[PDB]
């Protein structure tokens, strides 16, 4: 079910494809409930949530939030995504690295044989903790999430990305 | 207490979700100062009365001003807790402005970070609700 192409950053899970060329029209489809997350009432929604209810995943329901470049357009590109299974997503971690991020990398490695982090010219994927929401997720920042080249190069240095 | 709270706030940025880096400085909060945080899910992050008032009773306006994303499960928090500083303590502070405005909100709110929030802040009064 779950794979990640470490040469181009493309994630496949539960029949969903999340890659750098994924558009709104490609992702936001099928019987699957995608919801604005957050909704914007003027229709300018750019981030969407889906919840995978698999009856074979020990770690529970998988929360996915996908972010697009721009409002409305069928061809807006994904700039970022993140996901986690319910059982691994919530809890207190006091430092950048701790049990929540470690347990997410363990789980992902069990599922895919891929040891995070992974990165390249396309972006960067790693487990990370959100200290505002007290959540951990597997986070992908694609190159299109960076509005300037200098922002991208500084991020690469800070996050040990080399290509 | 007396730790480098500015550096702690800064450390939570520049990777993962919050890849933008705000400008953080240390300030001494005074005994009896009031700060505000979302509830449930108390963290090291707080905001001031000015930021709360500017939201005009809208949770989206509030969290966009602080560049906080809706919780992956629960969404935006709809309850606010006031807290009182129990003793003079260092906080990290500055403006929440450095994230992508499309995704996070335009920002501009005043944030505080206190790693010692569990011991230095006392909740005061009932939580109060805020609207959409
Ligand atoms: Br598990
Ligand atoms: Br920790
Ligand atoms: Br740390
Ligand atoms: Br650019
Ligand atoms: Br640079
Ligand atoms: Br930006």
Nearest Cα residue to B35 out of B105, B109, B99: B109
Q: Which of A39, A88, A132 to mutate to test the interface with B (most CBs of B within 10 A)?
A: A132
Say yes or no for a CB contact (<8 Å) between B15 and A158: yes
User: What is the SS3 assignment for B37?
Assistant: strand
Alpha carbon B78 to its chain centroid, in Å, reads 14
| Per-window interface: A 6-35 vs B, CB < 8 A | none
Largest CA distance in chain A: 44
Contact A58, A1 (CB under 8 A): no
Interface test with B, best of A77, A124, A133, A145 (most B CBs within 10 A): A133
Resolution (A): 1.3
The closest CB to that of A96, out of B11, B71, B72, belongs to: B11
Resolved by: X-ray
Q: Is A7 exposed, middle or buried (0-12, 13-18, 19+ CB in 10 A)?
A: exposed
Cβ atoms of B48 and B113 within 8 Å: the answer is no
- Short-list B123, B100, B69, CA closest to A79: B100
Locus of tokens 């959100």: A130
- How many angstroms does the Cα of residue B97 sit away from the middle of ligand 6? 9
Which residues 6+ apart lie within 8 Å of B51 measured at CB? B36, B62, B65, B66, B109, B110
Helix (H) or strand (E) holding A101: helix A99-112
DSSP state of A144: G
Contact A68, A46 (CB under 8 A): yes
CB of B35 within 8 A of CB of B105? Answer: no
- How many Å lie between the centroid of ligand 5 and the Cα of residue A65? 29
| CB of A144 less than 8 A from some CB of B | no
**How far apart, in Å, are the Cα atoms of B73 and each of A38, A154, B51?**
12, 31, 25
Cα B52–A91–B116 angle (5° rounding)? 55
Closest CA to A9 of A131, A123, A126, A136: A123
Cβ–Cβ < 8 Å for B83, B123: yes
Which residues make beta-bridge pairs with A46?
A: none
Tell me which chain B residues have a C-beta less than 8 angstroms from the C-beta of A133: 41, 43, 68-69, 71-72
Alpha helices in A2-148 (DSSP H): 24-27, 86-89, 99-112
Listed residue (A31, A80, A86) closest to A61, CA to CA:
A86
Angle among Cα A105, A110, B16 to the nearest 5 degrees reads 20
């Amino acid at each position: 079910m779950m794979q990640l192409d470490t040469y181009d950053g493309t994630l496949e899970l539960a029949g969903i494809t999340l890659g750098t060329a994924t558009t709104r029209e490609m992702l936001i489809k099928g019987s699957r409930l995608w919801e604005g997350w957050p909704e914007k009432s003027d229709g300018r929604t750019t981030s969407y949530r889906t919840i995978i209810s698999t009856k074979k995943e020990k770690a529970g329901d998988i929360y996915i939030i996908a972010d697009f470049s721009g409002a409305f357009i069928t061809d807006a590109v994904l700039c970022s995504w993140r996901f986690a299974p319910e059982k691994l997503m919530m809890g207190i971690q006091k430092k950048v690295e701790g049990a929540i991020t470690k347990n997410l990398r363990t789980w992902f490695y069990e599922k895919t044989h891929i040891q995070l982090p992974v990165s390249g010219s396309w972006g960067h994927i790693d487990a990370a903790y959100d200290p505002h929401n007290l959540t951990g997720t597997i986070v992908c920042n694609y190159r299109s999430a960076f509005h300037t080249e200098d922002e991208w190069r500084k991020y690469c240095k800070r996050n040990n990305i080399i290509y | 207490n007396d730790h480098n709270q500015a550096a702690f706030g800064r450390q939570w940025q520049g990777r993962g979700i919050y890849k933008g880096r705000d400008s953080w400085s240390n300030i001494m909060l005074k005994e009896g100062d009031i700060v505000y945080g979302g509830a449930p899910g108390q963290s090291g992050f707080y905001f001031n009365k000015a930021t709360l008032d500017a939201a005009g009773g809208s949770r989206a306006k509030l969290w966009e001003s602080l560049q906080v994303l809706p919780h992956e499960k629960f969404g935006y928090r709809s309850k606010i807790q006031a807290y009182r500083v129990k003793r003079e303590t260092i906080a990290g502070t500055g403006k929440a402005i450095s994230q992508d405005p499309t995704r996070f909100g335009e920002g501009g709110g005043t944030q505080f970070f206190l790693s010692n929030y569990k011991t230095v802040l006392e909740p005061i009064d009932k939580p109060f609700e805020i609207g959409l």
